[PDB]
Design a protein around this ligand. Structure first.
Ligand SMILES: Nc1ncnc2c1ncn2[C@@H]1O[C@H](COP(=O)(O)OP(=O)(O)O)[C@@H](O)[C@H]1O
Ligand SMILES: [Mg+2]
Ligand SMILES: [Mg+2]
Ligand SMILES: [Mg+2]
Ligand SMILES: [Mg+2]
Ligand SMILES: [Mg+2]
Length: 222
């Protein structure tokens, strides 16, 4: 096969994340929230399904902001506890189809890690997948080409990649690539999107959250 490795040296470098504690998850929430808020007017204008009522971005932003506010007032090193705080804030602030779905995605994500103090890349992936399950079960009649589709494709990318990727930065980068591909495909699933010439507004809002998650993993601010 290969050279048998036996070196006592430990690999170098700083730009990698092995474990996510409660303050890194808080930073992901905060930066995700801020990135969404900065894009809310755009996400509103994209809204066409089920009605073109100009509100997806507002709805998602208000929902996410409720979660963020609870987090910022109640930080913890324990990721499971921080997730309970985030979940509660989303669920007591969910607005619209998109904000309800967002709160259910993150309810299932957070429930999956409730007893953890920190998570690794595999459990980050598993938590995205748990959130997709929760959200699909919450919606009586799921429709494809939507925030659900983008979340599901993102979580299956996460599962696959995490199996051989310990770095949560590299994992989240891949999740975003694959979530973007799914978002760009939404008009091929939901007719009104292709007729109007837009991607799904809920899916776009979710991408905005994920992009902020990556900024936080890199130790950066939106
Ligand atoms: N049945 C559904 N299945 C999946 N996603 C849905 C469904 N209904 C709505 N959505 C999502 O919600 C987004 C619209 O959110 P929003 O504008 O907040 O809804 P509304 O103003 O109709 O309450 C859609 O672009 C889509 O992502
Ligand atoms: Mg509405
Ligand atoms: Mg709307
Ligand atoms: Mg387990
Ligand atoms: Mg898929
Ligand atoms: Mg890197």
């Amino acid at each position: 096969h290969h050279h048998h490795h036996s070196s006592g040296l430990v690999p170098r470098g700083s730009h990698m994340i092995s474990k996510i504690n409660g303050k890194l998850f808080a930073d992901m929430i905060i930066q995700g929230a801020q990135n969404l808020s900065n894009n809310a007017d755009l996400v509103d204008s994209l809204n066409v399904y089920p009605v073109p009522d100009g509100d997806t971005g507002t709805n998602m932003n208000l929902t996410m902001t409720s979660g963020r506010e609870e987090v910022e007032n109640n930080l913890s090193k324990n990721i499971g506890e921080l997730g309970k705080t985030f979940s509660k804030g989303l669920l007591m602030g969910a607005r619209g189809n998109s904000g309800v779905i967002l709160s259910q995605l993150f309810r299932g994500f957070c429930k999956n890690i409730e007893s953890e103090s920190e998570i690794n890349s595999k459990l980050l992936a598993e938590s995205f997948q748990a959130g997709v399950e929760t959200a699909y079960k919450a919606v009586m009649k799921p429709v494809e080409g939507t925030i659900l589709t983008v979340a599901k494709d993102a979580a299956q990318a996460a599962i696959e990649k995490a199996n051989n990727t310990e770095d949560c930065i590299e994992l989240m980068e891949y999740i975003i690539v694959k979530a973007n591909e799914s978002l760009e495909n939404t008009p091929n699933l939901l007719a009104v999107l292709k007729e109007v010439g837009v991607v799904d507004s809920g899916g776009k809002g979710l991408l905005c959250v994920y992009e902020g998650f990556l900024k936080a993993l890199k130790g950066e601010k939106v």
